[PDB]
Design a protein around this ligand. Structure first.
Ligand SMILES: Cc1cc2nc3c(=O)[nH]c(=O)nc-3n(C[C@H](O)[C@H](O)[C@H](O)COP(=O)(O)O)c2cc1C
Ligand code: SF4
Ligand code: SF4
Ligand code: SF4
Ligand code: SF4
Ligand code: FES
Ligand code: FES
Ligand SMILES: [Mg+2]
Lengths: 230, 217, 431, 62, 42, 59
C-alpha cells in the first residue's frame, strides 16, 4: 500500500521506498542535484540535495533517503537554503574561472544552480587547484580542472556501457577522475558522458567552440543511422 | 601540503605493462590461502591482501604487478589502480631498502619530533622526500602511527622504534647501514606503554580463573 | 560521590604493559577462556541482557549503547551469513589502547569476538587491523592459531555446538578506513569510502550481509562482563557512564602512559597520579584535548575540575571520544598544534563529499595563514562559518571531527589569533 | 549573413494546455500536428541496492 | 614476575610471517558461504 | 568614457584578446554583432567571423 508523506505540508501518497527527491518531484518540486541521475545508481556524494525534515535536527540527502510515514519535507526552509549555499560555496571555491572559454556556457548546471540556489559573492581568498588534463580519444575533450567529482561518468560507464575503465585515483582534495593510464574510452555510447557531465569537464570535441546554447534552434527529429529510430 | 606524487601513470622503460612480474609459487600458495577467506562470489575482496603481497615480494608496485593482481582476481585493472592509488602503504615508485617514516602529528610534534627528523636528514644527507644515492634509505613524514605515548617514534619496515632521541635514531641508522637489525621498541628504558617513573597500576599478581565469577553465568 | 582509584583486582585488562605471558597458557592463568561454553549455552538473549545491564557504551569514538547495537543485530535470519567486524584501525591521533590490547591480550580479544558472535548469531568475525600494526597482527594470528588448536574457536567452539570463524584482515594506511562503513568497503576490496545510512550495517553490511562493527576494547570487555556480572560493571562509573576505561595520557606530560581507570575519574587526578602531572606543574598547563584530535580542546579553567566522562565532557563543549588525553603546556604554539591537526584531517580526508573535501582543504589553508598571522580579524568568523558549513553536511563524521578542533581553538584562544594577526601587521607596517 | 523570406520563422506561441493550443490553431486556420506530452516514468531507486549479496546491482566502485 | 617484558617473540618476524600463519590456519576454517554466482559480473 | 568607433584589441604580445565567447553578441540590444568561431590551428578558441553592422549599432 501507499504511505502518506508531506511536502511543505501538502499530502502525497507514495509507494514505500520512494525517496525524498522523488516525493518532491511528485508534488512538482525539483530538488537541486549534481551527482544524482535517475538512470544511474545513487551516489549521494555531492551533498547538494540536502533538505530538512520537520523534526529532524539533521539534514538528509534527498536523493538517497527513503521517505518514512508522516514526514514533512521543508524544501524552502532556512536550513535547506543554507545547506545549498554552503555546498555551492565549496564547489565554486575550487572551480576555475573558465566560463567564457567553456563550451558548457549557457547550459551549465553549476551556473544555473549557482544563480538559483547559491550566494552571489565569494569568500575564497586562497589559491585554486589545477588538474592535469587527460586524453580519452578523439570524441570527448577533457578539461578536468572543471570536474566537480560527481562520479556520473564512472557510474554511467560501468552500469550503462559495461566499460569499467573510469575511476577515481588518489584521495582527498587531490582525487582525480580518469583512467590512470593512457587508455581511450572508446564505446558505442561514449557521448552520453558528454551529456551527463553537469560541468564542462567533458565536452564534445567536434562541437568545440563552434556555438553557444542560446543561439541554436532545436528541431525534434529521429535518427536514421540504424533501425532503432532514436 | 602538496604530496609531490602524481596519481597518473606514464609508461617508462623501467615501469610499463611489459615489465616482468609474476608471483613465486610460494606466493601463489599464499594467494590461494588468502582468497578462500571470503565468501564465494566475493573474490574481489582479496585485492588489498594480494596487492600487499605483490608489493612485499617486489619491493614496490609496478603497473605490471597491478595488472597481474587484476588478472588473478578477475577484477578490472581500474579497480586495482583505484585501490593502489587510494592506500598510502603501497609504493607505486621504487623505494629505498629501509623506508624511514617519521610521525609528525601533534602528539608526536609536542615532543621533539623535528629534532628526530633533522637528525635523520643530517645523518643521511637527504631531504624529507628523497632517497640516498646508494638506494638504501628513503625518508618520509607520516601521520599518527599508533604509538603516541611513545613519542617521538619512527617506523622502518614495519618495526616501531619509539621514545627516540637524535643519538638513538643515529645509532639505529648506523646499525641498519652496517648490516645488523636493531631491536624494535622504546629506547628510553621502558618496555612498552607503562609509565617511566614506575608502575602505577597492575603491581599485584593477576587473579586466577573464576575469580569474581557470577552465580549462574 | 567520587570516582577513581581503580583496584588491580577490578582492572579488566590485566597483562597490560606486557609483563606476563600473552599466550594461551598465560591468558588461561588469568580469567580468560573460563566457562565460555556455559556462556554460549546461556545464549544470545542472556548475553544481550548482561551487556544492557552493564550499560557498556562504545569505546571507539561515539558512545552508543552496545546492548542496543547487538540487539539490532539479533533479528531472525533470512538466508544470509552474519558477521562481527572488530575495528582495530586505530588511526586516531592520540590513541594506542587498541594496539596494547591486541599486542598483550589477544586471547581476550578472541574470546570477546566469540562471545559477541554467539550473542549476535554471527558465523564469522573479521578483525580489521591497520597495516602498520604488523607485529600486533602477527601476535593476533598466533593467538588465533592457539585457539583453533585448543578447540576454543572453529567447529563446535568450546564444545558448545556453535561454529564460529575468526579471520584477521590487514588494511593499508587510511584513517578513514578506520570508519565503520569505510571499514566494510575496505574489507570488500574497494577504496574504503563511507556509505550512506540507511542501509544500516545491521541490515546490509560487509558483502551485503548483516554485520555489526564493534571496537576492540568493547569486544574485549564483553566476555569479562558475561563471566562476571554487569551490576558490577555498572557499579564502576556514573549512572549512564559505567565501567572502566583505557586512557592514553600523552603530550607535554612527565610520564606519558596508557592506564586503566574508572569511567568518571577527574582529568586532573588522572594526569597528576598516573602520568606525573604537567611538565612544569599544573600551573604550566595551557590546554588539554581529552578525546583525540576530533574532540575540541578545553583550557586550564575547564581542566581544573572536569570528569573524564561522556556526559561530563559533553557539558564542557567537548567529547570523551577515545579518551586520548593530549596535554599542552604554556610553552606551546596552540595555533600551530591545531593547524597540524587540520593538516592531518586534510591528508586523511577520503574526498568523497564536496563539504569535507573542499572545505577541509580550505580550512587547512586558512589555518596555515593564521599560524603566521598573515590574515585579518574578520577571517576568524569566516573560518567559524565554513567549519559550521562542513559539520553536519558530510557523509561520515570525519567532516564533523575536522571542524570541532577549529571551533574549540576559535572559542578558547581567539585573543591569541588576534594578537598574532596584529604582530604580523606590525611587522609588515614597518616597511 | 543568413537570409530568410519567411515571416513566421521566429514565431513561437506558449499555451498552458493542448486544448488551448489546438483551439488557437483551429480558429486561426493553420494546419497542425499535435505531439502527446512525454513524462518520465516512475523509477525505483535504492541506495542499498549498490551492495547486494547475490544480485548484479552491486557496484564495483563509489 | 612483573619486571621482565615477555612480548619478545616479535623480534623474529619476517615479511611473510602473517601470510604463512594465514596459510597454516586454512585447515581449521569452516566452508565459506556462497552467493550463488561466481562474481557480480556474472 | 566616450563611445565612438569600435575596435578589437590585442594583448601586448600581439595575441587577440577575443576568445569568441559571444557575450557581446548575446547582450547587444540591436543584434548588430555576428560571431562565428572554431578551434585555431594551435587549438585556441578564436573567432573566424566577427561582424558589426554600424548602421544597426546604437552605440
Ligand atoms: C579504531 C577506530 C577508528 C575509528 N576511526 C573513525 C574515523 O576515522 N571516523 C569516524 O567517523 N569514526 C571512526 N570510528 C568510529 C566508528 O565509526 C565506530 O563508532 C566504531 O568503529 C564502532 O563503534 P563502537 O565500537 O563504539 O560500538 C573509529 C572507531 C575505531 C574503533
Ligand atoms: S563548467 Fe560551468 S561554471 Fe565551470 S567554467 Fe564551465 S560554464 Fe563556468
Ligand atoms: S568528469 Fe563530469 S561526470 Fe565525471 S565526475 Fe567529473 S563532473 Fe562528474
Ligand atoms: S566526510 Fe570526508 S572522509 Fe567522510 S565520506 Fe565524506 S569525503 Fe570521505
Ligand atoms: S565574443 Fe565578444 S564579449 Fe566575448 S571575448 Fe569576444 S569581443 Fe569579448
Ligand atoms: S544529488 Fe544527492 S548528494 Fe548529490
Ligand atoms: S601522533 Fe605520532 S604515533 Fe600518534
Ligand atoms: Mg558536459
Amino acid at each position: 500500500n501507499l504511505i502518506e508523506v508531506f511536502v511543505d505540508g501538502q499530502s502525497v501518497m507514495v509507494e514505500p521506498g520512494t525517496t525524498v527527491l522523488q516525493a518532491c518531484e511528485k508534488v512538482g518540486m525539483q530538488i537541486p542535484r549534481f551527482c544524482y541521475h535517475e538512470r544511474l545508481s545513487v551516489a549521494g556524494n555531492c551533498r547538494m540535495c540536502l533538505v530538512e525534515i520537520e523534526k529532524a535536527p539533521k539534514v538528509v540527502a534527498a536523493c538517497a533517503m527513503p521517505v518514512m510515514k508522516g514526514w514533512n519535507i521543508l524544501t524552502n526552509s532556512e536550513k535547506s537554503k543554507k545547506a545549498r549555499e554552503g555546498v555551492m560555496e565549496f564547489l565554486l571555491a575550487n572551480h576555475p574561472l573558465d566560463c567564457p572559454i567553456c563550451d558548457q556556457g549557457g547550459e551549465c548546471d553549476l551556473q544555473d544552480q549557482s544563480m538559483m540556489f547559491g550566494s552571489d559573492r565569494s569568500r575564497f581568498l586562497e589559491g585554486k587547484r589545477a588538474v592535469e588534463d587527460k586524453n580519452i580519444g578523439p570524441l570527448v575533450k577533457t578539461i578536468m580542472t572543471r570536474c566537480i567529482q560527481c562520479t556520473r561518468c564512472i557510474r554511467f560507464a560501468s552500469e550503462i556501457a559495461g566499460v569499467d575503465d573510469l575511476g577515481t585515483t588518489g584521495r582527498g582534495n587531490d582525487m582525480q577522475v580518469g583512467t590512470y593510464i593512457e587508455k581511450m574510452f572508446m564505446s558505442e555510447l561514449s557521448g552520453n558522458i558528454i551529456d551527463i557531465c553537469p560541468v564542462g569537464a567533458l565536452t564534445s570535441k567536434p562541437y568545440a567552440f563552434t556555438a553557444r546554447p542560446w543561439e541554436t534552434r532545436k528541431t525534434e527529429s529521429i535518427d536514421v543511422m540504424d533501425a532503432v529510430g532514436s | 601540503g602538496a604530496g609531490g606524487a602524481l596519481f597518473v601513470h606514464r609508461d617508462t622503460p623501467e615501469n610499463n605493462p611489459d615489465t616482468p612480474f609474476d608471483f613465486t609459487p610460494e606466493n601463489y600458495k599464499r594467494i590461494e590461502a588468502i582468497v578462500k577467506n571470503y565468501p564465494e562470489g566475493h573474490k574481489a575482496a582479496a585485492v588489498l591482501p594480494v596487492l600487499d603481497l605483490a608489493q612485499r615480494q617486489n619491493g614496490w608496485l609496478p603497473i605490471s604487478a597491478m595488472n597481474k593482481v587484476a588478472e588473478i582476481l578477475q577484477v578490472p585493472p581500474m579497480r586495482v589502480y583505484e585501490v593502489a592509488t587510494f592506500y598510502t602503504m603501497y609504493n607505486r615508485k621504487p623505494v629505498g631498502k629501509y623506508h624511514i617514516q617519521v610521525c609528525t602529528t601533534t602528539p608526536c610534534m609536542l615532543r621533539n619530533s623535528d629534532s628526530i627528523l633533522e637528525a635523520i636528514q643530517k645523518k643521511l644527507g637527504i631531504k624529507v622526500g628523497e632517497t640516498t644515492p646508494d638506494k638504501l634509505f628513503t625518508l618520509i613524514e607520516v601521520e599518527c602511527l599508533g604509538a603516541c605515548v611513545n613519542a617521538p617514534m619512527v617506523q622502518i619496515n614495519d618495526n616501531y622504534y619509539e621514545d627516540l632521541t637524535p643519538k638513538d635514531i643515529e645509532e639505529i641508522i648506523d646499525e641498519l647501514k652496517a648490516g645488523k637489525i636493531p631491536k624494535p621498541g622504546p629506547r628510553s628504558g621502558r618496555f612498552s606503554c607503562e609509565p617511566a617513573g614506575g608502575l602505577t597500576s597492575l603491581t599485584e599478581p593477576p587473579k586466577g580463573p573464576g575469580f569474581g565469577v557470577q552465580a549462574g553465568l | 560521590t567520587s570516582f577513581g582509584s581503580l583496584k588491580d583486582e577490578d582492572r579488566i585488562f590485566t597483562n597490560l604493559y606486557g609483563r606476563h605471558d600473552w599466550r594461551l597458557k598465560g591468558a588461561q592463568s588469568r580469567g580468560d577462556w573460563y566457562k565460555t561454553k556455559e556462556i554460549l549455552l546461556k545464549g544470545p538473549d542472556w548475553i544481550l541482557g548482561e551487556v544492557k545491564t552493564s550499560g557498556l557504551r562504545g569505546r571507539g569514538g561515539a558512545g552508543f549503547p552496545t546492548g542496543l547495537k547487538w540487539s539490532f543485530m539479533n533479528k531472525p535470519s533470512d538466508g544470509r551469513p552474519k558477521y562481527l567486524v572488530v575495528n582495530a584501525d586505530e588511526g586516531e591521533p592520540g590513541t594506542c589502547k587498541d594496539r596494547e590490547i591486541i599486542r598483550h591480550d589477544p586471547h581476550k580479544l578472541v574470546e570477546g569476538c566469540l562471545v559477541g558472535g554467539r550473542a549476535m548469531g554471527a558465523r564469522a568475525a573479521y578483525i580489521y587491523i591497520r597495516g602498520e600494526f604488523y607485529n600486533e597482527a602477527s601476535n593476533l594470528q598466533v593467538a588465533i592459531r592457539e585457539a583453533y588448536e585448543a578447540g576454543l574457536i572453529g567447529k563446535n567452539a568450546c564444545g558448545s555446538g556453535y561454529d564460529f570463524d575468526v579471520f584477521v584482515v590487514r588494511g593499508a594506511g587510511a584513517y578513514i578506513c578506520g570508519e565503520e562503513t569505510a571499514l566494510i568497503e575496505s574489507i570488500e576490496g574497494k577504496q574504503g569510502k563511507p556509505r550512506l545510512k540507511p542501509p544500516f550495517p545491521a541490515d546490509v553490511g560487509v558483502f551485503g550481509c548483516p554485520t555489526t562493527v564493534a571496537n576492540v576494547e568493547t569486544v574485549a570487555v564483553s566476555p569479562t562482563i558475561c563471566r562476571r556480572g554487569g551490576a558490577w560493571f555498572a557499579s564502576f562509573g556514573r549512572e549512564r557512564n559505567s565501567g572502566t576505561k583505557l586512557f592514553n595520557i600523552s603530550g607535554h606530560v612527565n610520564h606519558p602512559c596508557t592506564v586503566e581507570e574508572e569511567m568518571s575519574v577527574p582529568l586532573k587526578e588522572l594526569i597528576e597520579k598516573h602520568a606525573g602531572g604537567v611538565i612544569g606543574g599544573w600551573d604550566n598547563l595551557l590546554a588539554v584535548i581529552p578525546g583525540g584530535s576530533s574532540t575540541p580542546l578545553i583550557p586550564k579553567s575547564v581542566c581544573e575540575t572536569v570528569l573524564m566522562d561522556f556526559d561530563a565532557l559533553v557539558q564542557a563543549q567537548t567529547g570523551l571520544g577515545t579518551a586520548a588525553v593530549i596535554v599542552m603546556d604554556r610553552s606551546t604554539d596552540i595555533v600551530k598544534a591545531i593547524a597540524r591537526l587540520i593538516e592531518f584531517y586534510k591528508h586523511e580526508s577520503c574526498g568523497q563529499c564536496t563539504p569535507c573535501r573542499e572545505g577541509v582543504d580550505w580550512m587547512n589553508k586558512v589555518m596555515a595563514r593564521f599560524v603566521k598571522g598573515d590574515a585579518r580579524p574578520a577571517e576568524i568568523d569566516s573560518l567559524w562559518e565554513i567549519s559550521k558549513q562542513i559539520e553536519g553536511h558530510t557523509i561520515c563524521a570525519l567532516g564533523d571531527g575536522a571542524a570541532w578542533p577549529v571551533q574549540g581553538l576559535i572559542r578558547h584562544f581567539r585573543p591569541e589569533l588576534e594578537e598574532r594577526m596584529q604582530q604580523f601587521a606590525l611587522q609588515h607596517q614597518a616597511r | 549573413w543568413s537570409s530568410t523570406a519567411d515571416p513566421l520563422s521566429n514565431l513561437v506561441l506558449t499555451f498552458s494546455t493542448k486544448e488551448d493550443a489546438v483551439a488557437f490553431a483551429e480558429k486561426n486556420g493553420w494546419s497542425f500536428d499535435v505531439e502527446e506530452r512525454k513524462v518520465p516514468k516512475p523509477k525505483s531507486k535504492s541506495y542499498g541496492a549498490n551492495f547486494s549479496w547475490n544480485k548484479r546491482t552491486r557496484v564495483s566502485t563509489k | 614476575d612483573n619486571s621482565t617484558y615477555r612480548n619478545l617473540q616479535h623480534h623474529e618476524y619476517s615479511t611473510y610471517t602473517f601470510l604463512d600463519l594465514n596459510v597454516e590456519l586454512s585447515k581449521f576454517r569452516m566452508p565459506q558461504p556462497s552467493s550463488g554466482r561466481q562474481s557480480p559480473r556474472h | 568614457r566616450f563611445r565612438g568607433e569600435h575596435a578589437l584589441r590585442r594583448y601586448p604580445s600581439g595575441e587577440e584578446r577575443c576568445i569568441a565567447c559571444k557575450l557581446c553578441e548575446a547582450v547587444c540590444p540591436a543584434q548588430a554583432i555576428t560571431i562565428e568561431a572554431e578551434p585555431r590551428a594551435d587549438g585556441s578558441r578564436r573567432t573566424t567571423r566577427y561582424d558589426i553592422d554600424m548602421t544597426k549599432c546604437i552605440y
